[PDB]
Design an enzyme around this catalytic site. Structure first.
Site, PDB file in Angstrom:
ATOM      1  N   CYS A   1      -0.008   2.624  -4.020  1.00 14.73           N
ATOM      2  CA  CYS A   1      -0.711   3.873  -4.286  1.00 14.73           C
ATOM      3  C   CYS A   1       0.260   5.043  -4.064  1.00 14.73           C
ATOM      4  O   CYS A   1       1.294   4.871  -3.423  1.00 14.73           O
ATOM      5  CB  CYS A   1      -1.941   4.007  -3.384  1.00 14.73           C
ATOM      6  SG  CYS A   1      -3.181   2.840  -3.964  1.00 14.73           S
TER       7      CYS A   1
ATOM      8  N   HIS B   1       0.890  -1.154   0.000  1.00 11.79           N
ATOM      9  CA  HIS B   1       0.000   0.000   0.000  1.00 11.79           C
ATOM     10  C   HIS B   1       0.919   1.192   0.000  1.00 11.79           C
ATOM     11  O   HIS B   1       2.114   1.044   0.261  1.00 11.79           O
ATOM     12  CB  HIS B   1      -0.855   0.061   1.265  1.00 11.79           C
ATOM     13  CG  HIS B   1      -2.066  -0.807   1.212  1.00 11.79           C
ATOM     14  ND1 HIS B   1      -3.131  -0.543   0.381  1.00 11.79           N
ATOM     15  CD2 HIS B   1      -2.378  -1.943   1.877  1.00 11.79           C
ATOM     16  CE1 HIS B   1      -4.049  -1.484   0.533  1.00 11.79           C
ATOM     17  NE2 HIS B   1      -3.615  -2.345   1.435  1.00 11.79           N
TER      18      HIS B   1
END
Lengths: 4, 230
Positions: free
Chosen positions: B129, B87
């Site tokens: 991300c 992430h």
């Protein structure tokens, strides 16, 4: 769909 | 104009595969990430890297993995590769316990810090991300030299992953590498990965706010030569  | 590939080893390849996070981070399980890792494992191995996959690392573990790796003797290796699946937010990746600056993970390999990798390419591929923006789509050697960051998306944007197939960037990167990894220069490969992701993927979602979104990767190169895995 998934996002990161 | 090409990077000397005459070494007994292509190089090490560290794959950090973060799938499960601490609830304090509040980050969800990244389904499909194991598929990415296994695929990436087969590709980079085929390329001839000595790859080792590390699961659910924590920020310290990650920093250590990289500090240590940078400390090995890379004299008999042409390059070094590190792939980060996790992430992320702008400028930062998520360990299982929190977030650590990508800059910290990469700085270990600076020319002044990894002399045996000096004048050799240092490759980092990052699937994570970089913000929360969605793309709607439309119908003396410098110490900072010889690095290449193949990001899965552009600054400020989300990065897509399909639970059942893996992330777009990795599905793409692997098909390209499988077919051309041994015959095309790195920039050509990544440009094709860029085109593959942009044209062949479009988000499917029940949340209309997240439906039919597009994505374009981002390559940053400080390379000073052409790189061929051959």
């Amino acid at each position: 769909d998934e996002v990161x | 104009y090409q990077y000397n590939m005459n070494f007994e080893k292509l190089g090490k390849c560290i794959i950090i595969n973060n799938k499960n996070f601490d609830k304090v981070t509040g980050m969800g399980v990244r389904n499909g990430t194991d598929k990415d890792a296994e695929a990436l494992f087969k590709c980079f191995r085929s390329l001839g890297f000595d790859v080792i996959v590390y699961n659910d690392c924590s920020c310290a573990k990650m920093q250590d993995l990289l500090k240590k790796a940078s400390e090995e003797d890379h004299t008999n290796a042409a390059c070094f590769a590190c792939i980060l699946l996790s992430h992320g937010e702008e400028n930062v990746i998520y360990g299982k316990d929190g977030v650590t600056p990508i800059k910290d993970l990469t700085a270990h390999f600076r020319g002044d810090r990894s002399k045996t990798l000096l004048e050799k390419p240092k490759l980092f591929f990052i699937q994570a991300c970089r913000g929360t923006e969605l793309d709607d789509g439309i119908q003396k050697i410098p110490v900072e030299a010889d690095f290449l960051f193949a990001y899965s998306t552009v600054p400020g944007y989300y990065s897509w992953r399909s639970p059942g197939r893996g992330s777009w960037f990795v599905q793409a990167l692997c098909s390209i590498l499988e077919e051309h990894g041994k015959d095309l220069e790195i920039m050509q490969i990544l440009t094709r990965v860029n085109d593959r992701v942009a044209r062949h993927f479009e988000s499917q979602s029940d949340d209309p706010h997240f439906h039919e979104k597009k994505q374009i990767p981002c390559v940053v190169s400080m390379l000073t030569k052409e790189l061929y895995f051959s």
